[PDB]
Amino acid sequence: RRFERDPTIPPDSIKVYSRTLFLGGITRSVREPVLRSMFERFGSVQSLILNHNYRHGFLKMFRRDAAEKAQVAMENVPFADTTIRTKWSVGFGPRECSDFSTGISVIPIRLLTDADRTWLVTAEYGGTGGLPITPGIALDEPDI
């Protein structure tokens, strides 16, 4: 688990690496079992939800490094009547604190909600692995 002292982090902040990818271009010809098999090449898929009414989906990998590999490989993939476009999702903490190009956030601890704080410490994957939230640490996205 990532619990990395990172001297690039400002005072009273943490850094969080998203494990979640946004999937764009999801027409009805693009189905969950096929996407799952595509992304399993890069590592174990923790969750995958498609919503064809919005032409999109969200895929979470157990590991941040697998998510990075999947994002670069699947960034623009012609498929049937569409192109699958894989980008980072930032679904944890304030979106104001994030680089959407890489799915990395630098979050002042004071802006975490109590729920955010609890998820960070209790997550099976990501988060602090049971340690307190303290400044200058980089973590992966917690399960909620």
Side-chain angles (χ1 to χ4, degrees):
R1 151 184 274 121
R2 193 190 305 260
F3 186 103
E4 183 182 316
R5 188 173 181 178
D6 179 345
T8 72
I9 301 177
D12 308 320
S13 300
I14 60 169
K15 176 179 290 174
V16 179
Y17 288 79
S18 179
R19 298 182 289 116
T20 302
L21 298 176
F22 169 87
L23 311 183
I26 307 307
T27 64
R28 287 173 192 284
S29 296
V30 185
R31 285 172 203 91
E32 189 276 346
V34 175
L35 286 171
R36 181 174 289 272
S37 294
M38 292 172 170
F39 278 85
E40 280 280 325
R41 186 168 74 100
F42 308 103
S44 293
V45 170
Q46 181 176 31
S47 65
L48 172 54
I49 298 168
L50 298 182
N51 196 320
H52 289 97
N53 308 287
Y54 295 82
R55 298 170 65 91
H56 63 232
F58 295 87
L59 197 152
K60 181 167 59 155
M61 309 295 288
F62 286 102
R63 290 182 57 103
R64 167 66 189 203
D65 59 6
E68 287 179 26
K69 301 181 190 163
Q71 193 281 319
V72 175
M74 298 296 311
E75 180 171 271
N76 188 271
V77 183
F79 186 91
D81 64 345
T82 189
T83 300
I84 301 163
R85 301 174 294 262
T86 304
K87 296 293 163 143
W88 289 102
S89 190
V90 172
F92 178 79
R95 290 184 308 182
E96 200 191 305
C97 294
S98 330
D99 183 0
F100 276 89
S101 294
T102 58
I104 297 168
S105 305
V106 173
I107 307 165
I109 293 169
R110 61 177 204 271
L111 300 176
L112 293 170
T113 68
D114 287 349
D116 289 337
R117 295 174 57 90
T118 301
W119 309 147
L120 277 166
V121 304
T122 67
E124 188 185 7
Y125 292 91
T128 66
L131 288 167
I133 302 161
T134 51
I137 299 294
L139 311 169
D140 294 329
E141 182 192 349
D143 296 330
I144 59 148

